[PDB]
Structures are given as C-alpha cells and as structure tokens.
Design a protein around this ligand. Sequence first.
Ligand SMILES: OC[C@H]1O[C@H](O[C@H]2[C@H](O)[C@@H](O)[C@@H](O[C@H]3[C@H](O)[C@@H](O)[C@@H](O)O[C@@H]3CO)O[C@@H]2CO)[C@H](O)[C@@H](O)[C@@H]1O
Length: 366
Amino acid sequence: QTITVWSWQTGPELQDVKQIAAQWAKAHGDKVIVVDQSSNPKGFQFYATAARTGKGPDVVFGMPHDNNGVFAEEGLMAPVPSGVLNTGLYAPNTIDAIKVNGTMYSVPVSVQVAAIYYNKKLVPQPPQTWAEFVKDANAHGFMYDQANLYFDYAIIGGYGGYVFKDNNGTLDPNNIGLDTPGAVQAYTLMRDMVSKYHWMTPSTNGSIAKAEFLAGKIGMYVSGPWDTADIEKAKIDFGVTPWPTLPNGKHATPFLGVITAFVNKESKTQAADWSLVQALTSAQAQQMYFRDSQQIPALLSVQRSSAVQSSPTFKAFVEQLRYAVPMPNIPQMQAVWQAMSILQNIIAGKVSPEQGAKDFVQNIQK
Ligand SMILES: OC[C@H]1O[C@H](O[C@H]2[C@H](O)[C@@H](O)[C@@H](O[C@H]3[C@H](O)[C@@H](O)[C@@H](O)O[C@@H]3CO)O[C@@H]2CO)[C@H](O)[C@@H](O)[C@@H]1O
C-alpha cells in the first residue's frame, strides 16, 4: 500500500530524500509518502505526540538524537535489527548517540557541530581568539540564538559547566553542572554580550540573527548546515569557522548532534521500513545530502571523500570535534530544553547570573 516518512530535514535534503524514496518504491512497489515536519509547531517531540495516539508515521528521517531517549523510553521505536548497523563505520560517539539504555534505536545519517558562519565581504579572515572576535564583532556585527542552550552551551562548557555528568559513557541525571561557578561565569558572559559589548539586545534570537546575516547586515552568526541553502540563495559569500576561544583562553564546546532515521514500533511493515531507512542513509545518500547542503556524513568512509575533506564546513567540523560534547539523549534532557527560557531572563538582566543559574537547575529538576 503506502509507507509514510516524516522528515524534519527540509529544503534540498528533503528533495533528495524524496528522490531516493521514489527510487526505492520503483523496486519495492510500496508507494512512499514523505511529509515535511520541519516547521511543525510541536517541534521534534511531535513524533511522540502523534505516536502516543497511534497516528505516527512508519519511518522518521532527520531526527536529532537527543529526542530519541523519550521515544525509546515510551516504546515508540523499533530496535535496530541485528546487522543493520556496523559500529565500526562511525566514530564512537556517533554510535553511542543512537543507543538508549545500551540498545541501538536509530541509524546515524549526519553529524553536526554548530559553527560561526561569516560573510567574507565583511570579514575576509575569520577570528580565532576572543580578542580577534571582539574586533570583528564590533566592526561588522555578531548575533545568534543567544538564549537557546543548544547554541550557548558552547560557552557554558568552555567555562567548565555541563548538563549531566558523563562518567563511563553513562550520564548521571542527578549530577547537573548548569549551576556551577563555571556555568555562572558563562551566563555572565552571555549577559555581557548585551550589556557590555552591545552586540545584541535582550530580544535578539536565532530568527533575527539569520535574517540579519542573509541581509548582509552582520558579519557573523552561529549556525549549521541547515542554513546552507538559504545562505547561498541570499548570495552571501560565506565561510565557516570554529567558535573562537573564549575570554578564559579555552575552546568553546559546541554540542555534537547526530541526525538520525528510525522506525515506528507500531508500523506494520517494519522489514520494508528498515530497507527504506537503509536507502535513505546509505553512503550514496549521505554523499547527496552533503552535495546539496554540506551536511557532514555520519559514515567515516564518506567523510574521507575528496568533496568532504576539501569543504570549509568539514574543516570547521574537524577543528571542533574534539571539543564537542554529544548531546544527552536521556528523557531528562527535554526537561532541560524546556527550562532554558530562564537564560533569556539572565541575558535581559531580569535576574542575576548567579540567581538565574540556581533557578535554571531548580526548574530542570521540576
Ligand atoms: O533548542 C532546543 C533544541 O536543541 C537541539 O536542536 C537543534 C538541532 O539538533 C539542529 O539540527 C538544528 O535544527 C535545525 C533542523 O535540523 C533543520 O532541519 C531545520 O528544521 O532547522 C532547525 C533549526 O531551526 O538546531 C536545533 C536548535 O535550534 C535539539 O536537538 C532539540 O531536540 C531541542 O529541542
């Protein structure tokens, strides 16, 4: 009959997913419907919302790995069949990212590490140290999704903060590091980018920063390959560079995100589903996704290809990978995303960095 795929990746990559799915259907006979969920107001967790009522898709494509802890815990994901995944074809952290309680629940398709996207017309040579960064930010502007933990964690970790303690590949949900002296130092710098450097105002966010960058108004912003298409469409002669070292001289620690594909536990055609997932996540598929958006392949063999090794996106990626922190995928991580709004209060000056940190962790525990 028909197999439904929900994709949280849009633009050129979605076009490729549709092309691959159509080629798959040509051989298998099953009609494949690909739905774009990238703009769904319910976000990534909409999968759980839908699956909980038995209205989910057969296959999910383009889901950031942190979300799967919830889905797996609630029994909404079919475990990856034996053999489908060869752990040796990926970096260690990539496979750990798709395991929940030791079980592999999804297939890695891409790896992501946020970086600074800059306009070469304004910033010919990218900054690498905080001092150089200040000079370029002052001269041509800097903005980003400042109150979004996904991005500002780069500063938190750079100062020694952390979400959940990672000891022996196992995260400890009870050991939170978002209220430590280091984390407070980071929150203070976040506030300072508004109150001291004046690069942003309390209202500045990701949407505004992207719009400003596409208009050629700011020389730098923090983003990822999901913006490649729009940046090129805006005809910006862009470059990609790692986060600069911070005021403490340490490297920023952006999160490592693994984009995944998986199968609904309730799907009636799971064998066919996994075959489709394999087609959507093959070396060739990843080559296509990279070609059209610069999304870094999860497969090491594709990363080692000439097109990838020579790209600016990959260069920034390999220069930050050792400092990147895999996002926690346990269910409790959603409570963290849900409480990060307090970062906005700190950045606005409504609450001190010290008090805000305390409230952040308390709101997370809740
Ligand atoms: O902000 C909370 C949010 O953080 C993490 O999400 C990030 C994604 O992991 C990352 O890929 C990127 O999301 C982009 C989608 O991949 C892309 O297809 C398209 O939809 O645009 C998105 C950005 O607008 O950035 C987000 C952070 O904004 C984490 O994985 C989420 O579960 C969490 O809710």
